[PDB]
Amino acid sequence: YKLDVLSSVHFVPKPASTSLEIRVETPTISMEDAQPLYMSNASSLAPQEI
């Protein structure tokens, strides 16, 4: 972190990482920020993922 900030963030990135992410299903209302409004009321998993 401090080498990147010292280098004034011109750096060369980290090589590669095929990681592994678990996402639960939930409303995308609940995946949002705290404000009065919303943007989308879908579910985070597709029909072909359910």
Binding site: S43, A46, P47, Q48, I50
Partner: protein, 109 residues
Amino acid sequence: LGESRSRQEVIFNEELDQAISILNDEQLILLMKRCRDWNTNAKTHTIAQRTIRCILMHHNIAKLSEIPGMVKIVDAIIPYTQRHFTRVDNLVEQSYILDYALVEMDKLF
């Protein structure tokens, strides 16, 4: 279903939907297993939707809930019905270019 579309509350012939009304738990749960897996197409979905419709209007809803296994099926094929509803609603909203063409053809004279 095709001959039901052909001729003419009831969606099949009435002897067929009373025959689907008088079937028990094991038969209706396997019928909804394969209505679930027919509903994943965009072609074979209408037969599945009308079989789900006649099950819903010829059986008892509390019975359908209390059958063990029919909450992992209806969770599986509610969102398919949702995307088919959005697709057919988009199709019927882009159906009004016929109406726009009619009003242009009427303003022609």
